[PDB]
Each structure stands twice: as structure tokens, then as C-alpha cells.
Amino acid sequence: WMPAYACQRPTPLTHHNTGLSEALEILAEAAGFEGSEGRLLTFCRAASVLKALPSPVTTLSQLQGLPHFGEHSSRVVQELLEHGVCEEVERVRRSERYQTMKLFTQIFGVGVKTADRWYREGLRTLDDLREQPQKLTQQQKAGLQHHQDLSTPVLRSDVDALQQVVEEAVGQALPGATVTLTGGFRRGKLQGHDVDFLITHPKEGQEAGLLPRVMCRLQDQGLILYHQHQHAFERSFCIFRLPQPGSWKAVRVDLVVAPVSQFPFALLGWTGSKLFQRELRRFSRKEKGLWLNSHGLFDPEQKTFFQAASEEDIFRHLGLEYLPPEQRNA
Ligand SMILES: Nc1ccn([C@@H]2O[C@H](COP(=O)(O)OP(=O)(O)OP(=O)(O)O)[C@@H](O)[C@H]2O)c(=O)n1
Ligand SMILES: [Mn+2]
Ligand SMILES: [Mn+2]
């Protein structure tokens, strides 16, 4: 037996049902490409159930008594168990629509609505996009310029080198300022599509104007290929030029600044997983009547914000057993 919400159960990094969860996640992703948001969430939830199981699913009897495991997801697993392959999944994999939407949406700065628009307009390849530079934002141009490197999984060794240059720049700009690794790497992942950092300072307001100083420092060291600064939290969505022995690699890096009062909420929100956070927010609203986001936890009946010093505070306030980041891999 297993609880309904992903935020009520530990989901570890490595599990016993990777083939099955991957097939369900293909169907979820394809659903999102078609704007089918309900079906996306349903497949995502079913995949995350399999990730939380203690043993491999070898036979269909193992499905018994699991939440969020409807007829469709059951059917998928059934064909995988009996036939080694699911027809619907293979047809999605082979389809030009899926392949092209995956190609485009992978690009830095391209979401589903942009990818779909380009698909509808007859664009198929990365060369097709480069032939129409008037259709691209400067962010997307940068994403295309570095697409091979940005398609290469980011490694822990890369994270460690990046955290060192970001920590050095932050420390030189403002002694006492801190850098915290968030995103998937905080959850224990060995690889990622980017590196996520959250920056703050223990005195509220001392973080003002810190990010542009950090970026100047990084730029003057040759480490920045692309930067877009947005005054929501202050953030810079970047492409770093990471030196490596004999060469270099472009790597996506998100730098987020939060005032220390909001840091616990920001750390929780940015640590993920995306599904875990969606589930945590749904749980907070539906079960506790509170609205959770990356800035705070709001009681809409009382018009009050919860004061939290830590993630542990937020879990406790919501009536949830604490899950460390490595158990949030929903
Ligand atoms: N503009 C954004 C981008 C991301 N996030 C959140 O930040 C976390 C990290 O996002 P991302 O790097 O996409 O996820 P990872 O789990 O780090 O995945 P990967 O290993 O692919 O980088 C997630 O909880 C996501 O919901 C957010 O709140 N606002
Ligand atoms: Mn990430
Ligand atoms: Mn990110």
C-alpha cells in the first residue's frame, strides 16, 4: 500500500521499474505536446507510482491496489510485460510529430507553443530553423548555436567546477553571500540538462544588485556565452563556457536570487522534482487550504503568510513527514 500524493511518499533516485516508467513518460510527454494536460498528469502520476515501488513489476498482479493506475496505464504495462513492447509507445517514438516536438522543445528558450507553431508552419529540422532567423529570439539563436553541447548531459564533475566559479564570483562581489545547488543535482542525480543555483545573503536586502556584479565577474573571465537578466525572483538564465582538459563545453546554468525570508520556499520550489512540486502544491491547496509557491505559503481565508526558517518548517506546517531532496524524485 502506498499514499496518493507523491509528497506523502519517498521516491528515490534509482528504482526497479525504469523500462515501465520510461514508456509511461513517453506517453505523458506526447500528451503535453498535443496540449492534453490532463492525460500528461495522469501518465506522470502512474510513472511516479512505479518509481516508488520496492520491487520490479514482473507480472500484472503486482499492479493490484495502487493509486493513480487507471485502465490506460495498466494496458501499457500489460503489453510491455507480455510482449516486451507497447504498440502505442513505439508508434509515438517513430512519429514525425513527436520526434520534431522533442527536437524543438529541447532547444534552449523553446516551449511547446513555439515548437507546435513551428511544426504547423512546416519546420522540421534545426537547419530549417537556422534558415529562418527572423523567427527566432536571441535566446533561441543561442540555443541553436550551442545545441550539440546543450544536448550532452551535464555531469556532476561539471557541476562541481561551475559551483566553484559561481561561489568565487559571489564571494568576491559580496562577502557573506551564499550559493546553494538546487534542481536535480540536489536530489542526487548524476546528470542533468542544466545546473540550478539559488543565491542569498543572511541580511535581508544585502542581495540587492548582487547578480549583475556576479555576472560582470563571470563575463570578464570568459565564462559566459549567453546571459539574459530578468528583474518573481531576480534571475539570470545563462549559457556558461566550461573549460575542460583540451577543449570546452557550453552548459546551461540558472542563477536565482532570493531574499533570505523567502529562501526556504525558493529552495523547496527549485529543488523539485517538477512533479513532486506540483503534487506538494495540490496537496497544500486541496488537503490544507493553503496556497504554496516558490515565494511563500499563503492562507487565503486569513490573508497570512507562513514564516519558515527551513524546508522542514514547511513540511511540518503542511502536516507532512519530511522528505530529504534525494527522496523527492517523483
Ligand atoms: N522558470 C522555472 C524553471 C524551473 N523551475 C523549477 O525549478 C526546478 C528545476 O528545474 P529543472 O532544472 O528544469 O529541473 P531538474 O529537476 O533540475 O531537471 P534536469 O536534471 O533535467 O535539469 C523544478 O522544480 C522546476 O519546477 C521554476 O520554478 N521556474
Ligand atoms: Mn536542473
Ligand atoms: Mn533550470
Domain limits of the chain? 1-95, 96-152, 153-260, 261-329
The backbone torsions φ and ψ at residue 103, rounded to the nearest 5 degrees and listed phi first, read -55, -55
Place of cell 570546452: 248
Q: Is 203 exposed, middle or buried (0-12, 13-18, 19+ CB in 10 A)?
A: exposed
Q: Considering Cα of 261, then 264, then 267, then 269, what sign does the dihedral take?
A: negative
Question: How far is it, in rounded angstroms, from Cα 12 to Cα 253?
Answer: 24
* Rounded distance from Cα 254 to ligand 1 centre (Å): 9
- CB 146, CB 182: distance < 8 Å: no
Upstream peptide bond of 273 is cis (omega within 30 degrees of 0): yes
Q: Which of 219, 226, 214 is nearest to 251 (CA)?
A: 226
Which residues, 6+ apart, have CB-to-CB distance to 41 below 8 Å?
28, 278
33: number of Cβ within 10 Å: 22
Cα 98 from chain centroid? Answer: 20
Question: How far is it, in rounded angstroms, from Cα 181 to Cα 215?
Answer: 17
Is 196 designated active site?
Answer: yes
Fold topology of 153-260: Beta Polymerase; domain 2 (3.30.460)
Fold topology of 1-95: DNA polymerase; domain 1 (1.10.150)
Calculate the dihedral angle through the C-alpha atoms of 19, 25, 27, 29, rounding to the nearest 10 degrees: -150
Question: How far is it, in rounded angstroms, from Cα 244 to Cα 257?
Answer: 28
Question: How far is it, in rounded angstroms, from Cα 213 to Cα 203?
Answer: 18
Q: How far is CA 131 from CA 10, 123, 128, in A?
A: 47, 10, 5
Question: How far is it, in rounded angstroms, from Cα 142 to Cα 135?
Answer: 13
Is 220 designated active site?
Answer: no
Cα 195 from chain centroid? Answer: 10
What is the Rg, in whole angstroms, of the alpha carbon atoms belonging to the chain?
21
Residue 159: all three cell numbers together: 557541476
Breaks (C-N over 2.5 A) in the chain follow: 231
Domains 1-95 and 96-152 share a fold: yes
Question: How far is it, in rounded angstroms, from Cα 252 to Cα 237?
Answer: 8
Give residues (CB < 6 A) around ligand 1. 183-184, 189, 192-194, 196, 269-270, 272-274, 277, 294
Q: What is the 3-state secondary structure (H, E, C) of the chain?
A: CCCCCHHHCCECCCCCCHHHHHHHHHHHHHHHHCCCHHHHHHHHHHHHHHHHCCCCCCCHHHHCCCCCCCHHHHHHHHHHHHHCCCHHHHHHHHCHHHHHHHHHHHCCCCCHHHHHHHHHCCCCCHHHHHCCHHHCCHHHHHHHHCHHHHHCCEEHHHHHHHHHHHHHHHHHHCCCCEEEECHHHHCCCCEECCEEEEEECCCCCCCCCHHHHHHHHHHHCCCEEEEEEECCCEEEEEEEEEEECCEEEEEEEEEEECCHHHHHHHHHHHHCCHHHHHHHHHHHHHHHCCEECCCCEEECCCCEECCCCCHHHHHHHCCCCCCCHHHECC
Neighbours of ion ligand 3 (CB under 5 A): 194, 196, 254
Give 87-91 contacts, CB < 8 A, sequence gap 24+. 88/27, 89/23, 89/26, 89/27
- Which amino acid is it at 237? F
Question: How far is it, in rounded angstroms, from Cα 165 to Cα 158?
Answer: 11
Residue 53: all three cell numbers together: 515501488
Residue 204: all three cell numbers together: 535581508
Point out which residues pair with 196 in neighbouring strands. Answer: 254
Q: Considering Cα of 106, then 112, then 118, then 122, what sign does the dihedral take?
A: positive
- Determine the atom of ligand 1 nearest the C-alpha atom of 278: 26
Question: How far is it, in rounded angstroms, from Cα 225 to Cα 227?
Answer: 7
- CB 178, CB 166: distance < 8 Å: no
* Ligand located closest to 271 CA: 1
- State the pairing for strand pair 247-257/195-200: parallel
Question: How far is it, in rounded angstroms, from Cα 251 to Cα 295?
Answer: 27
Q: Which of 79, 104, 82 is nearest to 27 (CA)?
A: 79
Max Cα-Cα span within the chain: 61
Residue 120: all three cell numbers together: 504547423
Question: How far is it, in rounded angstroms, from Cα 330 to Cα 82?
Answer: 26
Resolution (A): 1.8
* Rounded distance from Cα 252 to ligand 3 centre (Å): 8
- CB 190, CB 145: distance < 8 Å: no
Place of cell 506517453: 27
Please give the CATH superfamily to which domain 96-152 belongs. 5' to 3' exonuclease, C-terminal subdomain (1.10.150.20)
Fold topology of 261-329: Beta Polymerase; domain 3 (3.30.210)
Residue 194: all three cell numbers together: 542544466
Place of cell 557573506: 176
